[PDB]
């Protein structure tokens, strides 16, 4: 019930957690999920702490699929800690790559319109009960309407990775973050 030296090392290489933190996380993850596999229903219960279960469920399924890199139906500790590390301590570039893999539902390497609207509908449903939204990006259709007409360079009905990454950096919260670049 400690990571084997060889696995510990492999995870220190593929994450931004220290040994102690990986050790602590493995203990916790096992203590909370004695099987060492986290399924969809379990994951939705994690999300339901933060937002009503029924509301968050469709977003929680989309995220679960992004964590589940081999797409077998469950998240093992490697898949979980890696995915957590990227999203919580990753570089902004690779955060947004990970978000792109999520938005791109068929995995053809292009965010289609009906792919975008799906995810945004789920994000809006999850938060509907607590967040009050802007006004112009304040229905999913309204929001999705903004994105493509701020992001679709050629207007090929699709968003490539490159159109997405750049587009997102105007997201107001990313505009806040860039003012903290330690390259003053
Ligand atoms: Ca899996
Ligand atoms: Ca696609
Ligand atoms: Ca395009």
Author numbering: 6 to 189
Q: Which sentences did the original study use to describe this structure?
A:
HPCA or hippocalcin, is a member of the neuronal calcium sensor (NCS) protein family and is highly expressed in hippocampal pyramidal CA1 neurons, in particular in their dendrites. It contains four EF-hands out of which only three are capable of binding calcium. In response to increased intracellular calcium, hippocalcin undergoes a conformational change and translocates from the cytosol to cellular membranes through a Ca2+/myristoyl switch mechanism. The extrusion of the myristoyl-containing hydrophobic N-terminus region from the hydrophobic pocket allows hippocalcin to localize to membranes where it can interact with downstream targets.
The structure of hippocalcin is similar to all NCS proteins and contains 4 EF-hands (helix-loop-helix motifs) and 10 α-helices. As many NCS proteins, hippocalcin has two lobes, N-lobe is formed by EF-1 and EF-2, while C-lobe is formed by EF-3 and EF-4. Electron density revealed three calcium ions in EF-2, EF-3 and EF-4 binding sites in all structures. Cryptic EF-hand 1 did not bind any calcium ions, as expected. The crystal structure contained two copies of hippocalcin in the asymmetric unit connected by insertion of C-terminal helix of chain E (residues 181–190) into the hydrophobic groove of chain A. This packing is facilitated by salt bridge between guanidinium group of Arg181 and carboxyl group of Asp37, and hydrogen bond between OE1 Gln184 and NE1 Trp30. Interestingly, the same fragment is expected to be involved in target binding. However, comparison of hippocalcin crystal structure with neurocalcin delta and NCS-1 revealed a different orientation of the C-terminus part of the protein. In NCS-1 the C-terminal tail appears to be able to sit in the hydrophobic groove in the absence of ligand and there is evidence to show that this tail acts as an auto-regulatory mechanism to control target binding; it is not clear at this stage if the C-terminal tail of hippocalcin serves the same function but it also sits in the hydrophobic groove in observed crystal packing. Equilibrium calcium-binding titrations showed that hippocalcin has a high affinity for calcium binding (Kd = 65 nM) with positive cooperativity (n = 1.4) as observed for other NCS proteins such as VILIP-1 (37), recoverin and neurocalcin delta. We demonstrated that hippocalcin oligomerises upon calcium binding with molar masses consistent with dimers, trimers and tetramers.
